[PDB]
Design a protein around this ligand. Structure first.
Ligand SMILES: Nc1nc2c(c(=O)[nH]1)N[C@H]1C(S)=C(S)[C@@H](COP(=O)(O)OP(=O)(O)OC[C@H]3O[C@@H](n4cnc5c(=O)[nH]c(N)nc54)[C@H](O)[C@@H]3O)O[C@H]1N2
Ligand SMILES: Nc1nc2c(c(=O)[nH]1)N[C@H]1C(S)=C(S)[C@@H](COP(=O)(O)OP(=O)(O)OC[C@H]3O[C@@H](n4cnc5c(=O)[nH]c(N)nc54)[C@H](O)[C@@H]3O)O[C@H]1N2
Ligand code: SF4
Ligand SMILES: [Mo+6]
Lengths: 982, 113
């Protein structure tokens, strides 16, 4: 008979996939029953059938996790690479901690900046920076935040900088928050699923099941708009090509089409958007530039990009929408230039295809039909990334799809916990809960709070950010405890104050000038992920010290090692001291991570890490305690802010996940009472809602939007009730979502002004005469139907913005601008303004930009379903699935170059080259653009010089070092290359 | 001598364990007039035992072992938050779940460990 079932007596552990943001549930199996004498060893992993999002499924990455956990390249011991050396030397943990602490203290004492030139205390350290792990837990994230800021660091970023930064920069100004608005299962309720600016079937496969459910079982139309015919296109009803970097033209064309054909949800637009608000008379746009442009500083004076004010100081309105200055009429005028012919001429999209897309999207302007957009990097990684997203968000507002089940903007997050690290503020000028570090111009607490607490711009609005002081003081109480009091302004001056944003491109420009001494790379592989790899390696080579914390060997940890063409360096010429510290992976700790739908999910430990590997919190603690002890006995610069930071854990060298998660949730530090004299919480208890946070020092929380995640009722992130009473796919009992378990953001907009559902078959909330109740937690207060209170409660005007006032760097309305490296060498809409006029481009990088005469083809980089960045190539199962590096080109380009399918080729740019196998296919076709034939060369990003897949080249060897004008997110999706037979 | 068991010829373990824990025979109040226990309920601490006939317990140091919160002797939480090997959630120890006797002496006169 068959072999016996191999898991019958194994230990079963629940955990979550460590790769993308879908957050699939896992059931891991270990050899051993937990007895102390048996050392657990995971030997099989499969899906959790009860998880509502994945329902047992796992894509090739999740399904192959065993080979990552047990990779031959797992790190085992602390290792050190000496200056000019070509080998690693194993050292003890104590040696690593002491050496690192000594290096850090010497650098901090030499370069710490206590006061700026204007005499303000700024307590900042800029000569050592850090990259944080979006693949690690929220608890690791908070410890990292405390570690970095208490030391005064401002060059602190996580993957968000090179990923969804543009989304936050655009969706927050448009809707009030930067997060994905709905959730995975909810996609099944859509009538139209739009995959543009993303490739969900390859980048979020298990989550994509719900788009297939919408298509197959809800009769939805699936549309894919991409320069390549992808695996998502394989199952699409409609496929339309588009040239990389032209989305704003295509989307603005859709806006023009909707307005011209009156295919909008008029009542939704009139009441829920700022369509009726009047704009200042001095606002204008002409020939590619908005009013207020300063050509020398290459920035805009945004004074004119604002509303006209009435006698009470609120925005003036014209409910009839006839006034020439209302947002609605100005929007109509702005997009009038984007005709179908213009779309075809710039995007290359045939008019017949564009028409099909317009018609289908237009069909969802009906109140009971919705479109949901699924996007990611195809839109974010451009110099106009934030504006790409602005245009789509505007479309969803015109169609009345925000706040609707089956609608919304599903900005699909990347790393398993990039959402959590963004929430916790591991970005240069951020603090947890979307709070902001003080700028150096804000000399006192009062000035700081006033700058961050917005005044309402229309009467009768929730304007919830008015509560900023309560969140800030509570954060300070969590950080400093008894040391933070009213008398010393809650420790205000201990936080580092910024003079500017220290984004990664800027910081590496500084590194190249010799201004950076050390760098930490915690679960981040910049040699593989940063743009212009040859320059990146050159920059890192100038560092005096580097500390890598990871569960795997990474290209960054071995940047000093010669790997032939893949990494042609001379170890003897690189003086950097490199420390490589072995950490745990997802399966070796308990903790929480936030998925794309804002679900904070708890997971449990399945085995101990291999060799001497330690968990991330232990590694930080080891370095931190060694460093603070040096300060205790030697003194030094910036002693007080460092020593005042709390590290209140039962075992200081081993902070536990539950301790940190509870800190994030928050506590009542004194008994708390409501206005009627009723006790809401007792001293020492966990808080149940951020509504209970106060600005008087009686409450603490290190992440206010997480209050409710772990209460006196227990760890809500561990909830496993998959009940869906409404049938809409909303499972309030599984895990816990922020804010306050609201699964669909902006849900008040799922109903009209009288509280009646736009679609009676999709009711999310309803009015019972005294409060809002329903199938989801209301993302609203208790304003009765008919009142002026808007549904976008984080907006000072309570509306979705069609006109983004003074929030965007390059304009209150999106506008087409070509990529820095463009195949046309001009912009057909306005030749006088070719690329984004507010883009920052350092002189050194401008010299490394190519032109179409030498690099005629559009280069773009993307993913394949089988691999996750340069991480999975360390796992055998995935290496077997896609073993060797390739690039994709059309049959037309291959024929012109004499390249046969499977032949070896050399793809190059102004910055470098890679060699690979050519995948010649009709899935890539040239487009007719502005009278030329434009070809695209596709470059997947999964291979490199470490791993078990066949050795290859870092794709970023080709990419330009320039980014979005708002977030400085690199333009990895549209540049120029050349190709030759190899 | 009482032998108050539902089946006199087969006393059950839970019946006797509850007798050992103890009961409030009348509603009990603290000095501030606050109800500490209702007539018929299991006592939560020997601190609530009285010398006036209103409380019963056949083993005072065992009061807290089986309360209105349930059989604490059946608790199976092996959590050790401090790392010192103290597991307050596994079973129940007398007196009042104190695992290390004389622990005030683990600190000096000023309360410092
Ligand atoms: N399989 C797998 N899954 C992943 C990851 C992985 O490494 N592998 N990484 C995770 C992370 S960190 C993230 S951020 C997501 C991102 O996931 P996505 O952004 O969906 O994925 P990408 O593969 O980067 O590419 C997006 C698509 O845009 C197309 N494209 C290129 N230029 C443009 C353009 O200018 N306009 C439009 N409209 N399309 C363009 C590309 O051909 C590509 O198919 O993936 C996550 N999921
Ligand atoms: N050409 C081009 N460039 C890109 C992109 C693109 O589309 N094209 N996309 C960009 C985006 S969106 C992203 S997110 C980046 C990602 O690029 P990176 O995040 O740098 O790359 P990864 O390979 O995902 O590796 C991160 C590390 O996390 C480690 N890790 C796993 N679990 C833990 C843990 O618990 N603790 C620690 N300390 N480490 C852990 C993994 O082993 C891995 O080495 O690439 C970006 N760069
Ligand atoms: S990579 Fe994403 S889609 Fe695949 S199993 Fe992991 S979480 Fe699910
Ligand atoms: Mo990403």
């Amino acid at each position: 008979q068959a072999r016996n079932y191999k898991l019958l007596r194994a230990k079963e552990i629940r955990n979550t996939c460590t790769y993308c943001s879908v957050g699939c549930g896992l059931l891991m199996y270990s050899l051993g029953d937990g007895a102390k004498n048996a050392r657990e060893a995971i030997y099989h992993i499969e899906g959790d059938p009860d998880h509502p999002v994945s329902r047992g499924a796992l894509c090739p990455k999740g399904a192959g996790l065993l080979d990552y956990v047990n990779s031959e390249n797992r790190l085992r011991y602390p290792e050190y690479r000496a200056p000019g050396s070509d080998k690693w030397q194993r050292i003890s943990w104590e040696e690593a901690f002491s050496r690192i602490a000594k290096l850090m203290k010497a650098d901090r004492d030499a370069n710490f900046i206590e006061k700026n030139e204007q005499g303000v205390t700024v307590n900042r350290w800029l000569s050592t920076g850090m990259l944080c792990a979006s693949g690690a837990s929220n608890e690791t994230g908070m410890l990292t935040q405390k570690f970095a800021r208490s030391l005064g660091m401002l060059a602190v970023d996580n993957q968000a900088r090179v990923x969804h930064g543009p989304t936050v920069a655009s969706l927050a100004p448009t809707f009030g928050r930067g997060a994905m608005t709905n959730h995975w299962v909810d996609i099944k309720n859509a009538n139209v699923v739009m995959v543009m600016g993303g490739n969900a079937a390859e980048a979020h496969p298990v989550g994509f099941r719900w788009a297939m459910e919408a298509k197959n079982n809800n009769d939805a139309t699936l549309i894919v708009v991409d320069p390549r015919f992808t695996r998502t296109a394989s199952v699409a009803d409609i496929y339309a090509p588009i040239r990389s970097g032209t989305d704003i033209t295509f989307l603005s064309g859709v806006l023009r089409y909707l307005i011209e054909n009156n295919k909008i949800n008029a009542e939704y637009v009139k009441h829920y958007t700022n369509a009726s608000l009047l704009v200042r008379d001095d606002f204008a746009f002409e020939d590619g530039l908005f009013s207020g442009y300063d050509a020398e500083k290459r920035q805009y004076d945004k004074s004119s990009w604002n509303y006209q004010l009435d006698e009470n100081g609120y925005a003036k309105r014209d409910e009839t929408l006839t006034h020439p200055r209302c947002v609605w009429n100005l929007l109509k005028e702005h997009v009038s230039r984007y005709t179908p012919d213009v779309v075809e001429n710039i995007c290359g999209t045939p008019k017949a295809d564009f028409l099909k897309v317009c018609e289908v999207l237009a069909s969802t302007s009906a109140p009971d039909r919705t479109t949901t957009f699924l996007y990611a990097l195809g839109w974010t990684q451009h110099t106009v990334g934030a504006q790409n997203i602005r245009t789509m968000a505007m479309i969803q507002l015109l169609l009345g799809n925000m706040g609707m089940a089956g609608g919304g903007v599903n900005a699909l997050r990347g790393h398993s916990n990039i959402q959590g690290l963004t929430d916790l503020g591991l970005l240069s000028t951020s603090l947890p809960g979307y709070l902001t570090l003080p700028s150096e111009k804000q000399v006192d607490l009062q000035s700081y709070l006033e700058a961050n607490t917005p005044k309402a711009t229309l009467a009768d609005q929730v304007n919830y950010w008015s509560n900023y002081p309560k969140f800030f003081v509570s954060l300070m109480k969590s950080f400093y405890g008894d040391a933070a009091q009213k008398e010393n302004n809650w420790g205000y001056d201990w936080l580092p104050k910024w003079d500017q944003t220290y984004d990664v491109i800027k910081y590496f420009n500084m590194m190249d000038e010799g201004k950076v001494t050390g760098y930490f790379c915690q679960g981040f592989n910049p040699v593989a992920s940063f743009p212009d790899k040859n320059k990146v390696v050159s920059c890192l080579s100038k560092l005096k010290y580097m500390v890598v914390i990871d569960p795997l060997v990474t290209e960054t940890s071995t940047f000093w090692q010669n790997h032939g063409e893949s990494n042609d360096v001379d170890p003897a010429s690189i003086q950097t001291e490199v420390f490589r510290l072995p950490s745990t992976c997802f399966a070796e700790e308990d903790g929480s991570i936030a998925n794309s739908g804002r679900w904070l999910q708890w997971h449990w430990k399945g085995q101990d890490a291999p060799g001497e590997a330690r968990n991330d919190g232990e590694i930080l603690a080891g370095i931190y305690h060694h460093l603070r002890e040096l300060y205790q006995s030697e003194g030094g610069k910036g002693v007080e802010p460092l020593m005042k930071m709390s590290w209140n854990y039962k075992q200081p060298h081993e902070p536990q996940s539950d301790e940190v998660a509870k800190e994030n949730n928050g506590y009542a530090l004194e008994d708390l009472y409501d206005a009627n004299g009723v006790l809401i919480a007792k001293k020492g208890q966990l808080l149940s809602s951020f509504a209970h946070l106060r600005d008087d020092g009686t409450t603490a929380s290190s992440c206010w939007i997480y209050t409710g995640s772990w209460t006196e009722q227990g760890n809500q992130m561990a909830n496993r009730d998959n009940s869906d009473p409404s049938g809409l796919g909303n499972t309030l009992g599984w895990a816990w979502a922020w804010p306050l378990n609201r699964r669909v953001l902006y849900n008040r907009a799922s109903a009209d002004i009288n509280g009646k559902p736009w679609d009676p078959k999709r009711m999310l909330i309803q009015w019972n005469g005294s409060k809002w109740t329903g199938n989801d937690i209301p993302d609203f207060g208790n304003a009765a139907p008919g009142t002026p209170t808007g549904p976008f409660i984080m907006q000072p005007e309570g509306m979705g913005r069609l006109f983004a006032i003074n929030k965007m760097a390059e304009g209150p309305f999106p506008e087409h601008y070509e990529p820095i490296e463009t195949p046309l060498g001009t912009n057909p809409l306005h030749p006088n303004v070719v690329s984004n006029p507010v883009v920052r481009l350092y002189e050194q990088d401008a010299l490394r930009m190519g032109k179409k005469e030498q690099f005629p083809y559009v280069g773009t980089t993307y993913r394949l379903t089988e691999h996750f960045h340069t991480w999975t190539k360390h796992a055998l199962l995935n290496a077997i699935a896609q073993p060797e590096q390739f690039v994709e080109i059309s049959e037309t380009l291959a024929a012109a170059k004499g390249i046969n399918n499977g032949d070896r080729v050399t793809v190059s740019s102004k910055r470098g080259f890679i060699r690979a196998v050519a995948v010649v296919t009709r899935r890539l076709k040239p487009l007719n653009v502005n009278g030329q034939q434009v070809e695209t060369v596709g470059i997947p990003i999964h291979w490199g010089f470490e791993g078990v897949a066949r050795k290859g080249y870092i794709a970023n060897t080709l990419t330009p070092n320039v980014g979005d004008a708002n977030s400085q997110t690199p333009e990895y999706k549209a540049f120029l290359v050349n190709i030759e037979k190899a």
